[PDB]
Design a protein around this ligand. Structure first.
Ligand code: CL
Ligand code: CL
Ligand code: CL
Ligand code: CL
Lengths: 130, 130, 130, 130
């Protein structure tokens, strides 16, 4: 199930000395896409007592991106636990909407932060998925 | 004279622990705007033997930007020398198009890179300004 | 087998609005550690016709880092193929040398870049591992 | 008067497609140096009700830095007002301690943040300077 599609313009300063987007920056793109998805659901990250924490990131690099470009990040529902969710991702560009530039996943766990303890996934996400 | 207006979306990761865009990032926004202006003029930065080099950056911070936001960078023609140009800038947001969030300038000098020597400003810029 | 230990100071600007190092930045730390390992082996990344390309990154986030801190990145030899190597990593801090802050791996493939084709791993790495 | 000397290792990912440190990153180096100076004075930036805010940054780029390198940031006392201080800077490298790679200043104003109003510079800084 597709949860969210984000369009993330590439900045010239995102490139490294290889002259393509630096490999680190793809994780910022993925972060931006999740933040936008969270925003659509009123999860604002703005110092809430409970919210999603990244446990694990996996990314496979398949094709480089070169400025100027707009990266398209598709987020898909992976497995939902009581307090965790796997968000699967695929990355394309606007000019190359069917090329897969990279893919992977982000495992999120919902935690009450001041307490360091897992808490249930919000109703909105259960509703979206389930 | 207004040379270029760029729209630069703010990324959540652009913020620092103060919860506003980190002061360093405004220079990336200014860089992106100049790169876009250069692109409109076919100055591609893509390893040309000659091109613009930043000599000096000045920026005055007036109002913070908080995600989500789109920064609007206006570039104005400052003083043009035989091989240098002052690009004056003003920064607003899309939601606050008349608030000045920051302002300053970037002095550019055209140089042949392998030689470290100043060269004339391209005709396109002289034409645009003059 | 431990291949390399890098010490990577944390910069204040590495933190995000959560007030810990931004999750993206751990990949820069891992990149810096690999670049330093490569440097010890005279793999300079400086535009060589052949060299290592990141195929995949996996990282598990276990404990946050807060500025000021020095991240310690340990790189271990994972599985070696004819033209690929898995570099396994563990992350600690100088003050907490036995806490595991994160762990994962980076799969590298050696490729001739202008040709997009896999090439053998350098003798130095085979020698180090084997 | 020299207030502080910081040593800031350059990271490979600090470089852009020109193959030198990206011009934006010098401002991060300057930020790191000020944060370290502030730390020596027990100004911790960690959510204090009052503290220094950057009003203006000026930097002149004189020589590029190429990885690997350690940037040396020297901070000097410029003019002290009742609630502002100009911190003048000069940038060198460890290998080139007398080459000036860049120079400029950062104007800081002390402000109570929740109120947006200038407040006196801390005794420690007046003592250091005066
Ligand atoms: Cl595109
Ligand atoms: Cl906006
Ligand atoms: Cl530490
Ligand atoms: Cl050095």
């Amino acid at each position: 199930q597709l949860l969210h599609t984000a369009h993330i313009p590439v900045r010239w300063g995102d490139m490294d000395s290889y002259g393509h987007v630096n490999n680190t920056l793809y994780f910022q793109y993925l972060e931006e896409a999740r933040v936008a998805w969270f925003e659509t659901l009123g999860i604002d990250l703005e110092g809430a007592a409970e919210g999603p924490v990244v446990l694990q990131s996996l990314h496979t690099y398949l094709k480089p991106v070169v400025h100027p470009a707009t990266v398209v990040v598709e987020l898909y529902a992976g497995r939902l636990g009581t307090s965790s969710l796997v968000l699967e991702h695929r990355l394309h560009t606007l000019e190359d909407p069917q090329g897969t530039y990279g893919e992977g996943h982000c495992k999120l766990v919902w935690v009450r932060h001041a307490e360091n303890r897992s808490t249930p996934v919000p109703d909105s996400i259960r509703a979206a998925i389930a």
